[PDB]
C-alpha cells in the first residue's frame, strides 16, 4: 500500500551521513525544485528498503513484447528477478500478441506476471486504459519500460515515487537549446528553446498509478488532437512525455544509471553503475 | 489547500539545470532517505512559488510568548510580513497570557494573526498545546504548520522551499559534529533515548513543522513520551528538543532544513558554509524589543 504518514522504523545502525560532505561532487543531485536525482551514493538503500517495506510495497512493470520482440522476454525477466526490487512485492505485466511465446521463467516470493493478449501512441492510450481496468486496484507504483533490455545491476525501492522520469543517456550533459523537443507551436508537445529542465527517455518512466495513468492519458489525448491537425510530433510518444514532465515536475529524476546503452555510449566516469542496459 | 496531484505549471523562463555541475561541492544537500537539506544554491524560488500558489498554500506560524517573551513579538511580526512566506497566505498563531500585550501590526492581504490565551512542565505543555489545537483549529485552517521560538527575527527570505510533509532543522552547534558529540537523551529510561551508534542529525526544537497531520502526530507523540518519562520521574537532557530528535530519528524528515534557518551569529559568528542568515537570535534587551 501506500500510507498517508511517515513510517516509524525499528533501531537500525549505518554510517551517519556528513553534513560537510557532498555525497557527489561531480554530479547534480537535486533538482531546483527539490527533487532527489539518483544516483549512487545518494542513498543508503536499507533505510529506504525498511521504509517500503513497511508498507508492504507492491511494483507493477510493464512492457510490450510485440511481434520479434517477445525474443526480449526470457533475458529482460530473468535479469528482472535477479535486479528489480528484490525483497518487494511484483506485478510483471506482459503486453503481448503471442502469448504462447511468453518464456517460463521462475518468480520469486511474492513476484507474479499476468500476460496481456493485444503504435505508440496506442502504448501510451493502453497503459491507462489498463490502469483502469485493473493496475489502480492491483499495485502501489507503476514502472513502464522497453522490453528490449537487461538489469545489469540493482533497480530498487530508490526510485520510486509519485512522478519519476529518466535522464535520456544522450543528452544529460547537454544545453537545453540541443535537447529534441518537438519545437513547433502547432503541435500538443511544443517546448520553446528557452524552456526545459532535462530530456526525458520515453523508454523507463513511472510513479504512483495514479500519477502513471494521468500522464499516459494525457499523452494519447495531446496525441490524438496532433493527429487531427496533421501533426506527429518528432519524437512520438517521447516528445510528449517530455511536455507532460517539464509542466508537471517529476518528485524524483533518475540519472543516466538506469538506462545506458554502452556498446553506443561507452562508459563515462560520472556512472558509478550500469544497472539497466539495452541488449544488442 | 494541498492537491493529491501534480500541479501543471504555467511557461516560466529560469537558468537550466545543470546535470553535470553540483548545486553545492561544500555540503550534503541530500539525505541518505532522498530528503532535499535546504541551502541557498539547492533550489529555484520562482517555480517552488509558482508549484505552491498556485494550490492557494497557507501557512500557519505557531510561537508561544508568555510572560516577558510578550516583548518580542513586535520585531518578530513585523520581520516576518518582510521575510516569512512572502507571496502566499500565512496564519499566525499566538499562545500568550497575556492577550492585550500582544502589539498592533500591520498585515498583508491573505495574512492573519489570531491570538491563543494559554501538572506538568512548560516543554510538555507546548507539544500538548500544538496538538491539542492541531485537532481543535490548525487541521480546518491550515495546509502547514511551523512551530518556532518568539526571541527570533527573519533577516532574510524563509519560504516555501521548507515546505514539506515533516521538516526539522539542523542545530547550530552540532552541524559539522559526528553523532557521538551530539547531546541526545542518553539514559536508556528515558523514552527519549538515543545510544551512541544511532543518530542522522541533532534537530534543533526552534523550528520544526510539516503538514498539519504530521505535526500533529509528532507533538502527540512527544507529548505522550513525556508523560512517560514524568511517571518515571525522569526529565530528558534538553527536554522537547531531546523527544524531538527521537521521533525524527524514526521518522525521517521529508525535508532537512540547513543551519542558515536558525542561527545565533553573536554566538557562533558566520562560517562561510553559510550564505544566507535566515532567522536569527534576538538578544534580551535589542531596541525593538519592549
Ligand atoms: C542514443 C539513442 C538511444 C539510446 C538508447 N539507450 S537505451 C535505448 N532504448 C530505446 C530502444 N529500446 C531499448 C531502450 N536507447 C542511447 C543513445
Ligand atoms: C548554541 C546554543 C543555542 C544556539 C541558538 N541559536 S538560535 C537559538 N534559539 C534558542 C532560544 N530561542 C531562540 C532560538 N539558540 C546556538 C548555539
Ligand atoms: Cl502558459
Ligand atoms: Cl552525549
Keep these: 500500500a501506500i500510507g498517508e504518514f511517515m513510517v516509524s522504523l525499528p533501531r537500525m545502525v549505518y554510517p551517519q551521513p556528513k553534513v560537510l560532505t557532498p555525497c557527489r561532487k561531480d554530479v547534480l543531485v537535486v533538482t531546483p525544485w527539490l527533487a532527489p536525482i ?7 538503500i536499507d533505510i529506504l528498503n525498511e521504509q517500503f517495506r513497511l508498507q508492504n510495497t507492491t511494483i507493477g512493470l510493464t512492457v510490450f513484447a510485440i511481434k520479434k520482440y517477445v525474443a526480449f522476454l526470457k533475458l529482460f525477466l530473468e535479469t528482472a528477478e535477479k535486479h528489480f526490487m528484490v525483497g518487494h512485492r511484483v506485478h510483471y505485466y506482459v ?17 507474479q506476471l499476468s500476460v496481456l493478449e493485444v503504435v505508440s501512441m496506442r502504448r501510451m492510450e493502453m497503459i491507462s486504459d489498463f490502469c483502469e481496468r485493473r493496475f489502480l486496484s492491483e499495485v502501489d507504483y507503476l514502472v513502464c519500460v522497453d522490453v528490449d533490455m537487461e538489469f545489469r545491476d540493482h533497480v530498487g525501492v530508490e526510485i ?24 513547433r507551436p502547432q503541435s500538443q508537445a511544443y517546448i520553446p528553446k ?38 506527429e510530433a518528432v519524437w512520438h510518444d517521447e516528445s510528449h512525455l517530455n511536455k507532460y514532465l517539464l509542466r508537471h515536475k517529476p ?3 533518475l540519472s543516466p544509471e538506469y538506462l545506458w546503452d554502452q556498446q553506443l555510449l561507452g562508459w563515462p566516469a560520472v556512472l558509478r553503475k550500469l544497472r539497466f542496459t539495452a541488449v544488442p
Design 251 to 253: 518528485t524524483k529524476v
Design 38 to 44: 539518483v544516483w549512487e551514493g545518494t542513498f543508503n
Design 160 to 183: 520510486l515515487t509519485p512522478l519519476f522520469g529518466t535522464l535520456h543517456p544522450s543528452f544529460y550533459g547537454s544545453s537545453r537549446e540541443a535537447f529534441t523537443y518537438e519545437r
Design 194 to 231: 528557452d524552456e526545459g529542465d532535462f530530456y526525458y527517455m520515453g523508454a523507463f518512466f513511472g510513479g504512483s498509478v495514479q500519477e502513471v495513468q494521468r500522464l499516459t492519458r494525457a499523452c494519447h489525448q495531446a496525441m490524438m488532437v496532433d493527429q487531427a491537425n496533421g501533426i
Design 95 to 111: 503486453f503481448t500478441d503471442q502469448p504462447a511465446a511468453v518464456p517460463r521463467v521462475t518468480l520469486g516470493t511474492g513476484r
